[PDB]
A paper describes a structure:
The apparent molecular mass of the native enzyme after gel filtration chromatography indicated that ChTK-N eluted as a dimer (∼62 kDa) whereas ChTK-C was purified as a tetramer (∼132 kDa). Initial attempts to crystallize the reconstituted active fraction of ChTK-F resulted in crystals of a tetrameric ChTK-C. It appeared that 200 mM ammonium sulfate present in the crystallization conditions had disrupted the formation of the ChTK-F heterotetramer. The ChTK-C dimer formation buries 1700 Å2 per monomer (13% of its solvent accessible area), which suggests a dimer is a likely oligomeric form of ChTK-C in solution. The ChTK-C dimer has exposed surface hydrophobic patches on the interface with TPP and ChTK-N. Formation of the ChTK-C homotetramer observed in two crystal forms buries these hydrophobic patches, however only around 5% of each ChTK-C surface accessible area is buried. Such a tetramer is observed in the two crystal forms and in size exclusion chromatography, however it is unlikely to be stable at the lower concentrations of the protein in solution. Initial activity measurements of the gene products ChTK-N and ChTK-C and reconstituted enzyme, ChTK-F were carried out using a colorimetric tetrazolium red assay that showed that the individual ChTK-N and ChTK-C did not possess TK activity but the reconstituted ChTK-F was active. The individual ‘split-gene’ products of this novel TK enzyme have been shown to have no activity in either a tetrazolium red based colorimetric assay or the more accurate HPLC assay. This is not unexpected since the crystal structure of ChTK-F shows that the PP and Pyr domains lie on separate parts of the gene and both are required to bind the cofactor TPP which is essential for the reaction to take place.
Transketolase (TK, EC 2.2.1.1) is a thiamine diphosphate-dependant (TPP) enzyme which plays an important role in the pentose phosphate pathway. It catalyses the rearrangement of sugar molecules by the transfer of a C2 unit from D-xylulose-5-phosphate to erythrose-4-phosphate, resulting in the formation of fructose-6-phosphate and glyceraldehyde-3-phosphate which are fed back into the glycolysis pathway. Here, we report the biochemical and structural characterization of the ‘split-gene’ TK from this organism (ChTK-F) which has been reconstituted by combining the two proteins encoded on the C. hydroxydothermus genome. This is the first example of a ‘split-gene’ TK that has been reconstituted and found to be active.
Author numbering:
A (entry chain BBB): 2 to 108, 115 to 279, 286 to 312
B (entry chain DDD): 2 to 312
C (entry chain AAA): 3 to 108, 115 to 283, 285 to 312
D (entry chain CCC): 2 to 108, 115 to 282, 288 to 312
The structure:
Amino acid sequence: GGIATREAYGKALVELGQENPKIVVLDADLSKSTKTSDFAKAFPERFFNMGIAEQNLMGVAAGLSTVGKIPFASTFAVFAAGRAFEIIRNSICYPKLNVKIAATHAGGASHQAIEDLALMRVLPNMQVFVPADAAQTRAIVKKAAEIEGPVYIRLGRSGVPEVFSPDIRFEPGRGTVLKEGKDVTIVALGIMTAKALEAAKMLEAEGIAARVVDMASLKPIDRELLVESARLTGAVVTAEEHSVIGGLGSAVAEVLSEEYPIPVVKVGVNDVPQALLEKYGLTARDVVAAVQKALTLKR
Amino acid sequence: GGIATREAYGKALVELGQENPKIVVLDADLSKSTKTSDFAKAFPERFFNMGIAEQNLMGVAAGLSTVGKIPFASTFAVFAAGRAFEIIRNSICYPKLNVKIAATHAGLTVGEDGASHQAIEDLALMRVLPNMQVFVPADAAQTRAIVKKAAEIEGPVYIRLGRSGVPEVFSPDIRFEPGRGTVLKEGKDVTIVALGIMTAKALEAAKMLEAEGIAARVVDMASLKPIDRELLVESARLTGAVVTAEEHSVIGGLGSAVAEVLSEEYPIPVVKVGVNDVFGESGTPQALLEKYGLTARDVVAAVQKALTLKR
Amino acid sequence: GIATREAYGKALVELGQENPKIVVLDADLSKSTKTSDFAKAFPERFFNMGIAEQNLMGVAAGLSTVGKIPFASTFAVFAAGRAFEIIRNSICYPKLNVKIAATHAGGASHQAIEDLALMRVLPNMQVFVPADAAQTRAIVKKAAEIEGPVYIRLGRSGVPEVFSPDIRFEPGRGTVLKEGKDVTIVALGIMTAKALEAAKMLEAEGIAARVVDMASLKPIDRELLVESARLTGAVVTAEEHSVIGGLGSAVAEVLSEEYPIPVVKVGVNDVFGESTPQALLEKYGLTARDVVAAVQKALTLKR
Amino acid sequence: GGIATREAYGKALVELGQENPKIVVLDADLSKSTKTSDFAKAFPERFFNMGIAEQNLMGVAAGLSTVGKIPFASTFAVFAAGRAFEIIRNSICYPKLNVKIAATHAGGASHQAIEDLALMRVLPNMQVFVPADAAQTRAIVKKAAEIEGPVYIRLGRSGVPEVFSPDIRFEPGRGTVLKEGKDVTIVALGIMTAKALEAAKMLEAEGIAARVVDMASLKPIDRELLVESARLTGAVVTAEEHSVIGGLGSAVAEVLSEEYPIPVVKVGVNDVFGEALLEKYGLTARDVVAAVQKALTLKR
């Protein structure tokens, strides 16, 4: 029972505020919890909390980034994929502004943005990071503050299992081998990383040794680690709480098809808390099933 | 060459208007050319020519589709990827409204220096939306077939059109079906999958490859979404390597769709020809990309790389 | 009596039966909206889609130029905020034939206390505020016949009956509901019935008040204001709206240039969103008793 | 032939910057003239020159005001009345944020905001100041920096006649008697103040003594001075380069009808038609003269 990535994000911003005087935080939420958050109390002069439309909040972030601030804009994936999309694309990505978008994803059907990562991935300059747990969130937030350019960080509201130690360092374009195995590689991000580890345990019990790779860095992706995993194991399963189109599965297939073609079987949302994970097919057992399918495709 | 796909579209709408009384056409352009287009003159009571913002034009199309009309909204890829994106996604795709978007895409030619005003990732943005089907005609004849089919199918459709004349590839009586592509040439060494302007260039490339002893199958895949999975898998089993070619970003378009399919069904090399740097590779001048585009020779180079990846 | 919002819904059905060019737009996706009388009677002329309110106004604008007469159901808070620019720039300056039916909720921002003032200052916009069900029906029918932008302010709660079912509405014409020689009370919306209550209370103290309903805020009935001024020598205005830029301001503008007399304004003085209907009226000072007090002040100002 | 109020504004910001470290200036204009303006050169770290949409510029001003800055947002009246209106009303006025909007007003028909003052006047908490000349602009800008709350200052690009001395002090809610007269009072603001003085001269030549009042403080308006002028002269003419509805004439009528009813005859824009201009719109000294003659006949 580790804390939510959204909660880890809030704590990481307080540390960043202490260490980096250029960091500013923007939030359009006017609730009491927001106004009395740790960042709000510790750095009131760098906390921009106003009742303004989400697309306008992104526009403010854009402006502040051009005058020497490093804005972290707290928002929701549904806004990023909808009403704020145009400003993100036209004002932030093409001009390459230094805005960090911290988008909470709630895990109609529209109000669930199942393709947020896909939309951000296709924009120029945008980097897309999906922390697995509290410790990785902190590492991603600190790194995002130091890199130049637009960043999308996907967060969650519910507690998620601990996967990494507190002193992990994050680097864009670098993933992590969490477990070794020669028969298949499972590449996962977000909540699916812990489930990939669970799946690898279940697979061991049936005589299948799975390498498990965390790929929080969805864009830019770790091409060399994917190619090395492909050469060693000969088959990949990707797992993401996201549409199977345009996310991790697509990014991995795009890389391997041009470098070292092997089976890539995608676990994700196919169509449009636990009962919904189960209906969409985002359990450890779903990953197991995908691995069995990946093994049959080896040639 | 043949006429522009944008021009074929306008003519096809006139025929549709004659055959199908539910078809309505929306266009925000108030120029003389628009007001006196053939559809405008033939069916003025079904031509909604309204000087409103492009997102509002799409909102009218959305509304008209819910009251029994079949709206064809003529717009630009720049609007679809920008100011109209939210209404397309939230009002048309998620609710699955019966709107056909005919989006003219500008050539590979930066505007003033607004690279954004190019919309080089239009197909990718439409592809990832639920329910949206994405069709990219190669020439006049295929445009007509796509427009007529789009009118009959239920649900949101994005049709990408072009302003410049493009070579004839298909015969006038071609039939289009979503999910079905076409083998234009047979060959056992590699398959070239292309759409839009790249289809004719893939045929040119196949000729150049023959002269070097490489026999290329060429497939037209105007139906980007849903894609022809069976034809891709058959091509993969027969030839063992694919090159994709699209006048579009290499991320999220045809190359990505093909790689997604083959990696889960029959993994083989998929080498992608498309726009790599959306600002222009800061090496070669603008005049070069403007004169050439992506070329048959680029497809040739991609094929040679694909052959080395066979295992 | 029923809510003006409810009378509006019924009137649209009648309009639909008589006028084939009428279309209704509504962004509300609730079951009540999808099964409203107009939705059921004229589904082919009902545009119900989840789109932003400013886009709904933009759609109404477009539809008005292709032969439809669009009635755009919205809220006063949207008209005064997110939809304001499209209303001003796309509908008013170009003079498009759009009818805005804005339900006014009776935070601070989420209460548009200046909706009428913002609409009044726009060119070409006419502004009508029905007192009750019968006047709503009359205003909706007239709005469909006039050419040009109209703002009709509606409410969600039941309001007392004031007019008979055969009332005719004409823009630019108000109505003397009660005669009196000492003062004139000019009111609109919910304040019309309260003006009648106030006039009864005033009669019991020997003050005879003329009561005028001015649902037609813009264009205002200048002639009736001037005649009331000449006959009674003092006016009280009453509106559920800011004292700046609404009925009181419109009346003062007219009388100061034609027949200057006291105009004492009853309305919202300061924002302070106070979350009961009655407690709200009392805190803002919109009761019959407040109108009585205003009349007493108006009498002392006669010169 | 003094300088433009927009130019006086630029100069006043430099002084404010020297005296007040919390002042920040926002401008979306990316031209060379803006980037090398005096404020830009003197205080580059407090000049936020960002090519963003005008409504986003206002959003930045809003945010900066809540973190201890005193932002002056340079914009145009057409943006305040259009694309930036919603942020001004919903983000700045209702929450009562400390933002000063310096709106240049150009002197379709939409792109001329003839009702900018009316739109700002009706919003809660917004104060509205319309300087007549360079000296009053400086005074208004300096005062705006000290008061708490949203302010709208209307500026112009063209040179305007000098009306006030360089050391004038401005106070919200206070107007100024510029000339005494017992027969009528002319209340004016902006460019109309100089013309009211011209009209008063013309009226003197016909035996009519007009008091002239400058009312740069449109909101809050100087109620006491209006009532005193009404008691002393018995008739008012208002003059504004603005729609006759919802501006100065309406503000004066609102006050006098509830305190001391007298004729208020309004000179202003009657009819919108983006179009010799002063003459067609009816904003000349002679128009003010004609209004005075009408006001005299209305005395009872």
